[PDB]
């Protein structure tokens, strides 16, 4: 069965990419824009933006390898390895023209290498709500005067003995609500039903493992990006971040200025990590305006 409701005018489909069967939801007409979700979620986080973008663009929203309805990767979970799959998927649908890319959270980790390595293929770029993996992330505090930090999960998820799978198995719904709401300012939008849907998807045993394998590969992605970042990004770029509890604040744009020559940024007040759901109206407006200019 489909894990999430598909909007009218969109199709749920699959494509084999380098031996890995990727799930995506596609609709609209025109130049291609690919939307890439992040941790704890699936293509469905984009379901409010997709019909609006589909008025002017062909829109494709894949499930990351191992998450949603996509098969796990065959190579590995580092950013360079996963970006191969996403690049080839986008190029199957836009072989003769560059495409636009919008990415959220670890979607950034899993697309940055193919952006920097195939710059001619990317017309415009939108990155929101996560650091590109580099040594800046080693400075985030573990514990705060406000209590539980927003980043202690980096170490928990990365632990090489699969501690996270071991402890969260059987408690997937409790943990996901904790994680999502503690990174949200607008907690109201995360209803019992929405959390149930996301929890069922990432509780699939291979998806729970895949979720944390992205973090187990994070230091490898850092090492990869230290080489890749010697070439700066030249296409027009926009960053978005939440300015409320749970967000990246000014860090998103400040980091991106070290990676991109042509970058504008926005911080959305009263919004946390989950921008498409917490602050859909202003976020959708910014993304559509940036891509439509």
């Amino acid at each position, epitope marked *: 069965a489909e894990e999430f409701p598909v909007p009218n005018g969109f199709e749920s489909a699959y494509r084999e990419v380098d031996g890995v069967k990727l799930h995506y939801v596609k609709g609209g007409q025109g130049p291609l824009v690919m939307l890439v979700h992040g941790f704890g979620q699936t293509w469905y986080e984009w379901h409010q933006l997709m019909p609006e973008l589909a008025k002017r663009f062909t829109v494709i929203a894949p499930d990351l390898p191992g998450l949603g309805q996509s098969e796990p990767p065959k190579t590995g979970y580092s950013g360079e390895q996963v970006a191969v799959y996403l690049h080839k998927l986008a190029r199957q649908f836009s072989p003769d023209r560059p495409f636009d890319l919008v990415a959220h959270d670890i979607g950034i980790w899993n697309t940055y290498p193919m952006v920097v390595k195939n710059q001619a293929d990317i017309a415009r770029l939108v990155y929101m709500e996560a650091p590109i993996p580099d040594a800046r992330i080693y400075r985030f505090p573990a514990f705060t005067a406000q209590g539980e*930090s*927003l980043v202690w999960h980096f170490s928990f998820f990365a632990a090489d003995d699969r501690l996270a799978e071991t402890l969260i198995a059987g408690k997937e719904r409790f943990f996901l609500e904790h994680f999502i709401k503690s990174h949200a300012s*607008n907690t109201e939008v995360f209803s019992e039903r929405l959390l149930d849907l996301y929890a069922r998807s990432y509780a699939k045993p291979h998806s729970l493992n895949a979720s944390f394998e992205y973090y187990r590969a994070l230091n490898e992605s850092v090492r990869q990006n230290a080489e890749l970042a010697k070439t700066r990004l030249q296409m027009p770029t926009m960053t978005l971040a939440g*300015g409320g*509890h749970g967000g990246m604040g000014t*860090f998103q744009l400040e980091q991106m200025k070290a990676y991109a020559e042509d970058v504008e940024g926005h911080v959305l007040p009263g*919004c946390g990590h989950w921008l498409p759901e917490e602050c859909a109206a202003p976020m959708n407006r910014l993304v559509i305006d940036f891509l439509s200019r």
Partner: nanobody
């Protein structure tokens, strides 16, 4: 993010006051709201704070007398001050802390004078 306190004034011992703080962003986007007071020449003290989940911290000498609360409908924070005493005279400030990934944001209102005489 902008905060504006109101509700201060001059009262006699044993009376009550209600301070309120208006917040320009969604209140659940504020990790901690803390009421601070400052009397002339004294060290500032944290009177009452409330996390967005509702955990409270109170200055010992106001426990049982003061109560801090959040009103997510009106998007305000309140400090109910009962059994006021001369020791409570001070300027009262509201402080908003916003926990982010790399740092914690810090915002303040301009304050309101409370005088118990």
């Amino acid at each position: 993010v902008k905060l504006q306190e109101s509700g201060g004034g001059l009262v006699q011992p044993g009376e009550s006051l209600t301070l309120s703080c208006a917040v320009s962003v969604r209140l659940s986007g504020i990790t901690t709201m803390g009421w601070y007071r400052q009397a002339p020449g004294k060290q500032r003290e944290m009177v009452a704070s409330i996390s967005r989940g509702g955990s409270t911290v109170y200055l010992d000498s106001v426990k049982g007398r003061f109560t801090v609360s959040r009103d997510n409908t009106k998007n305000t924070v309140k400090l109910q001050m009962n059994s006021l005493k001369p020791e409570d005279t001070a300027i009262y400030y509201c402080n908003a802390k916003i926990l982010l990934v790399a740092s914690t944001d810090d915002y303040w209102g301009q304050g309101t004078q409370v005088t118990v005489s």
